[PDB]
Amino acid sequence: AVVENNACEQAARMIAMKNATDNAGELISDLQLIYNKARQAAITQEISEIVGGAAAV
Amino acid sequence: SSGRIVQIIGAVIDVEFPRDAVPSIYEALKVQGVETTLEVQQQLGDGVVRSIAMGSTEGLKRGLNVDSTGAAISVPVGKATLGRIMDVLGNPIDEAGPIGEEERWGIHREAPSYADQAGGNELLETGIKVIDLVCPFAKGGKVGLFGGAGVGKTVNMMELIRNIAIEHSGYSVFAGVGERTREGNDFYHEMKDSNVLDKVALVYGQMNEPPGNRLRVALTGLTMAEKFRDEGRDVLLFIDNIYRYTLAGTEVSALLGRMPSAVGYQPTLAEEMGVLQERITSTKKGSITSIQAVYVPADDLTDPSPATTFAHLDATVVLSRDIASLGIYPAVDPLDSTSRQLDPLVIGQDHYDTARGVQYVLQRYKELKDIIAILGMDELSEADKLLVARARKIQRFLSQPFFVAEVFTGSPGKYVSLKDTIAGFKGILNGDYDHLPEQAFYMVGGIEEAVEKAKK
Amino acid sequence: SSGRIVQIIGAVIDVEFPRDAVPSIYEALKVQGVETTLEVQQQLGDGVVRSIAMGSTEGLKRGLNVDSTGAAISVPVGKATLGRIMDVLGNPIDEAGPIGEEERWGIHREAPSYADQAGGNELLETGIKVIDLVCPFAKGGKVGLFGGAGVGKTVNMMELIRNIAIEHSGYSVFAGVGERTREGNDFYHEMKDSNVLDKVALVYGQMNEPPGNRLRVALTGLTMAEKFRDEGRDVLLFIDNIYRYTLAGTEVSALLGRMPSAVGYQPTLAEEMGVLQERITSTKKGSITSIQAVYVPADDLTDPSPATTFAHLDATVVLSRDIASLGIYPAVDPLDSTSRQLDPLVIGQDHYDTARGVQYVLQRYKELKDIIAILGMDELSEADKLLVARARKIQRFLSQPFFVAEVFTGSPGKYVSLKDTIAGFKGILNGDYDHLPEQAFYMVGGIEEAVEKAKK
Amino acid sequence: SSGRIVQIIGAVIDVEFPRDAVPSIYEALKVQGVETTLEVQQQLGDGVVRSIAMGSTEGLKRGLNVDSTGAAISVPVGKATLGRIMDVLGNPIDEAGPIGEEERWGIHREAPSYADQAGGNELLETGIKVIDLVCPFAKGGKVGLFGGAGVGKTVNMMELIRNIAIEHSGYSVFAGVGERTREGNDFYHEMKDSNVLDKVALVYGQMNEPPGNRLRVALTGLTMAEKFRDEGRDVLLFIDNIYRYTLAGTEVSALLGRMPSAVGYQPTLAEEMGVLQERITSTKKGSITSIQAVYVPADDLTDPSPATTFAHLDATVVLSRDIASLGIYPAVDPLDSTSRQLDPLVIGQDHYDTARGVQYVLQRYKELKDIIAILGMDELSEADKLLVARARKIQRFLSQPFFVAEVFTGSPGKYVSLKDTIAGFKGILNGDYDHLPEQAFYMVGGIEEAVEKAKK
Amino acid sequence: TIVVAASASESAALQYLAPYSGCTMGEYFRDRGEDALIVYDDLSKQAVAYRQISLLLRRPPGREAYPGDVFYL
Ligand SMILES: Nc1ncnc2c1ncn2[C@@H]1O[C@H](COP(=O)(O)OP(=O)(O)O)[C@@H](O)[C@H]1O
Ligand SMILES: Nc1ncnc2c1ncn2[C@@H]1O[C@H](COP(=O)(O)OP(=O)(O)O)[C@@H](O)[C@H]1O
Ligand SMILES: Nc1ncnc2c1ncn2[C@@H]1O[C@H](COP(=O)(O)OP(=O)(O)O)[C@@H](O)[C@H]1O
Ligand SMILES: [Mg+2]
Ligand SMILES: [Mg+2]
């Protein structure tokens, strides 16, 4: 009984570590979309400031 | 005297007058062949003034004659406005004939002085568990409902109109600033059929309207409310969306020759808000309890308009799209929402401790989110698992079916007293309800209903 | 008449003309005594026009005379352009003498009208199995080509150039938008060695040329393709990189002083893409089909350039470095590559079910391969091991010897029909070839050739 | 001749002179009546010069007569400047009366030629473990203390001044640029009470002074150091914050009619920095050893100002906010700090191997930190568990209590020789002190002390 | 305590000047050998008032539409 439960512990751990790897990817994928939005937003703001200052000077 | 239209660009018009007859700032002008009204914003020199049209500019041309009226936009005030619908210029728009006005007041005024201010700490029970718990309101104070598109601002306002008209016996003033025309029709007929209409003054300037209307409708509503406050009366001033007053100002700012500020906003953003917000206060003569909905652009609470509005309010209710995505209604964020009345000297220690305890529990649950996201709840410590369980029950017990939402869902509305609200959350925090399933707390009003919901 | 250069600031030149002789927008102007061409961009007024030099401005001075030509940049068209290399203006950059032209056409015109469109969707039979099954191209359609270097991009273009000319009596045009001079010389010799040079017209805008040249080369190549379509042909238009066409527009827009848009692109981004892409269509005379290489900035598919381009793409062909290592030289990824024509309401139920069957089997095999790797081959069921055997046979049957690749493969080329393609894959999915070794299904062409390679 | 003020806007002033008497670029002008100096920055045309005030403009009026001095700002130089406090104009800002100068130099000058540069690697000991290990300074070299707000730039510089200037046999120049007036007072009383004020020239331009003052204070201090270098002497030059020189140029750039560049900086950022930085050098006559503190806006090392500064320095010491937030000082980042003297051919293989050994251990631990947060410590391999212990100890052993920081630390200051610095880290890397608790290496000077702290 | 008020409805010039007026009232004690304490409840609101005046005077903007001399303020 003890030995068989140890084999069960190893298999259960295999599936848990697979789940954890997949879940991590989903978080990476979601964060990457937010990063692309932050990247694009930063560029537009700087251009407005450059154009705004040049429209005064 | 009479001036000539010299320039037209969208909603903004320049008019030239004789050097001895130049109109003052905010003076109202009328175009001779169409009777379109213009409001003077600034004097440019050489007898030329710049103005915003209080209507459509399509069909206007250069060289038309313009008449100066000698005064600012003046609107009817007093008892004659109750049960009537008016536009930005004070004209009736309900087909019920002329208004029986006794006097008219200009829409531009100075805020009440520091020595005419009044302190209101009398709690105003709303009947909503989350507001009565973490955002207690006060009579004569200001409330703001912050939220993105489609999250609960109009529904959470209509419920507070129903549950505050239970104890209030005075008059109300409603100002519709840049919102849906259908929602103004729905609200008018609801009050007319319910016989509530004879105690409410209605003003509208919806999304269909040009920029000048949307920019001044807020002042026209407030001016009628001030008349009632200064007669020594208790009034309720409701503003459908205060952000549209600021936005109408952004559409016109570049046409007024102003350099833009951060993210394209007008350089005058904080002054325009304060000049309108300061007048909405309870003086010593009377009180103006005010509720204003605040739209949040692209769900960004750091945007200049929402960011500048928080300092003008006594209670801040922050709605969230994430809470709404889980099914909870009202979707109030207990960690972002707050009130000046949440003080031991105002509400008592028991209520203040129940709220502090609910917030402490939710804050820790928010911090554990990432670990549970990758490894699940089973790796947490024994105490952490217990908190995560109470945090989840508290989350669903903050949900409540409203009487203005039974049409959407079909379930009946619930009114919960401040006493029942405290008892339910105090019990869940103490652990008296640790044997009920989480789903016994969702949309159950009082805690006894959760006990009876758990029987199924 | 003639005008005079009044201002020179980099590639931007202002020219002044008599009030009765001002040249039109997009008109081509010639500087006297120097081989420099100016394209007119804007009419500033008071006789002065703003133009962009189609060459270097070094050594120019104010006061030089300029001559109007009466029309836009006009390039040679027809049979004489085949097997030749030309610049943006249609000049022969190869040292092979003047082009034997019979006619010249202006590079600017409107897209074919609503009435000129063809009466349905007709597939273009490329003769390549993986493309004709999983990535069906429509005549008059636009195909996006994705992938890195050294994965078969050039060989795939040469095979398409040969097949449209020999099997469909068509022709090809190649537009080198921002072409690298080293790669432009290498491609010209590879096409001469592969005997495909006499079936294609080469238009190059090299990276070291001013922004105006790189922006107009796509219209020069498209003008040559339009001529063949009018002849009664189906034509292939290859664009070396569509991102460089977008960037050349951004550069020109900045030089002309226009206010930049989101992420710094030109305000005209969608219109400049639409003006090019709307000429590529299936008319009532012929059909221009286009293969365009696509670059994605910062690997972001939401960036304005990728976003705008994807709106005009009918198919997406992805070339995979992994597949190449396996040994399948076509290297098109059957799971990542897609087509809008993969619809049963367009290609019929039979073609659609066969293609989706292959993709279903190939998906399951990719999942099973991770199982075989982590846990072992014995852990699979009998049905799964049988599927793996069909998937491996399918994967190798997606390979094909091209007439331009005989130097690499050491075997003769093959042109498989759509009928033979559907019939071959349908049998392998049903198991009609389960007794044959997988190698018998490698580099063979049609399914009868796998059966014969097997007997041996 | 004489000029009249024509336009005052903030710190920028326009002065109009006869078209035959226009003062030169960088020429100093004096206002009549008012005690104010203006430096010509630009010649607009028509006898007008654009200048910046070296004082306040609250008393300036249009039409005030301005006098041309025929030269640039001339400050006193030589032995008379030692033991004195001076402003940007060289006036004494101490109550000790006038300075007995025997010569005045102009603050503007050419950088030493390519043939005048001199190369030396004499190692300079500082007494700080982190610096003596990873950032070995050299005599005549350029050092930069990079860091944000509140991480130790002033404190570290004061410790160096104490461990070097006090022992230094030659003279010294201390320039406070955009510094707090309280730090300048504490340092003056410190040099005076320590009897070292006799060999130190003090130039102060604090944050309460006009932009023009903060823009030229660095040229005044450097002009005094150049007089001493050119006499054949060895000099020390300490600059409190060289960022304030760049910022003063940003504050005034837009009023000077210059279009802004990236991150709202002057378009002359790299040239204005190169013109100053190329004069702070050790030629073939004498050697200037210099330490500059470099402010990093918002802790971002990629900001244009910090990013343009690295290329001008020999030794780059980086201070980290994340280390300071853990109670660790000095907060030098060993993986971001660098030095040209770090080369086995300049110092030795034993020192170099110890430095690279420490860096290797800390670089590997930067990745295990997140691994330990998710999961736990138990899941690591024994080599990783053993490495994590040494890394946490080395991080702590880098901390050294300084005498100048006793007011803040409460403990006595310590001085560690490079020999002890090498010995201790080598032992920890060998694992000899793996028997000591982690808390024993925090602020313990030499490793010996750590062995004693473990017993308390 | 001395309370200096420049509320949200008052001119941007009064909000921009209020910290300097309060500072001057505190300096009276400092210059006469006495000790004083001053609280500026929002310097970020003083910076927003200064940005408004500067943009209406048409002075060229900086890093977030803020005046070039917002540090010196
Ligand atoms: N059961 C519900 N309870 C509360 N709000 C709901 C419910 N179901 C949907 N909502 C949404 O709440 C929103 C309330 O108005 P909202 O959209 O936030 O105001 P606004 O029009 O000004 O943006 C409506 O869009 C409504 O559809
Ligand atoms: N169809 C093919 N058959 C055989 N070999 C090929 C084939 N396609 C590509 N290759 C091999 O891959 C190399 C690179 O292909 P190529 O078309 O030149 O890609 P790229 O232009 O990006 O360099 C070829 O030189 C050849 O060695
Ligand atoms: N080595 C140190 N020991 C103790 N406190 C320090 C040390 N370095 C910096 N500090 C703390 O930071 C301040 C001094 O650092 P300072 O040189 O002013 O930083 P920065 O110049 O980078 O703004 C004090 O408040 C002090 O407590
Ligand atoms: Mg709404
Ligand atoms: Mg400092």
CSV table of C-alpha atoms in Angstrom, one decimal, chain D residues 69 86 104 110 135 144 153 161 166 172 177 195 217 227 237 252 277 320 322 338 345 349 362 406 424-425:
chain,number,residue,atom,x,y,z
D,69,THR,CA,32.0,94.3,-21.4
D,86,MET,CA,32.3,82.0,-4.3
D,104,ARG,CA,41.2,86.4,-14.2
D,110,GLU,CA,38.6,74.8,-25.8
D,135,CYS,CA,35.1,49.6,-9.1
D,144,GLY,CA,30.7,58.8,-11.6
D,153,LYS,CA,25.3,60.0,-3.8
D,161,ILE,CA,36.6,63.3,0.1
D,166,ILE,CA,42.2,64.9,3.5
D,172,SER,CA,41.1,70.6,-4.3
D,177,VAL,CA,25.8,72.5,-8.4
D,195,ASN,CA,41.5,72.4,9.3
D,217,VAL,CA,28.6,77.2,-11.9
D,227,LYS,CA,44.5,77.0,-13.7
D,237,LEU,CA,37.7,68.1,-8.5
D,252,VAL,CA,15.9,77.7,-20.6
D,277,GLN,CA,33.1,66.8,-19.9
D,320,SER,CA,20.4,50.7,-6.3
D,322,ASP,CA,16.2,48.0,-4.2
D,338,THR,CA,32.2,48.8,-13.7
D,345,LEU,CA,47.2,43.4,-16.6
D,349,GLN,CA,44.7,37.9,-11.3
D,362,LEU,CA,25.2,37.3,-7.2
D,406,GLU,CA,27.4,57.7,12.1
D,424,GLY,CA,37.0,38.1,3.3
D,425,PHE,CA,35.2,37.6,0.0
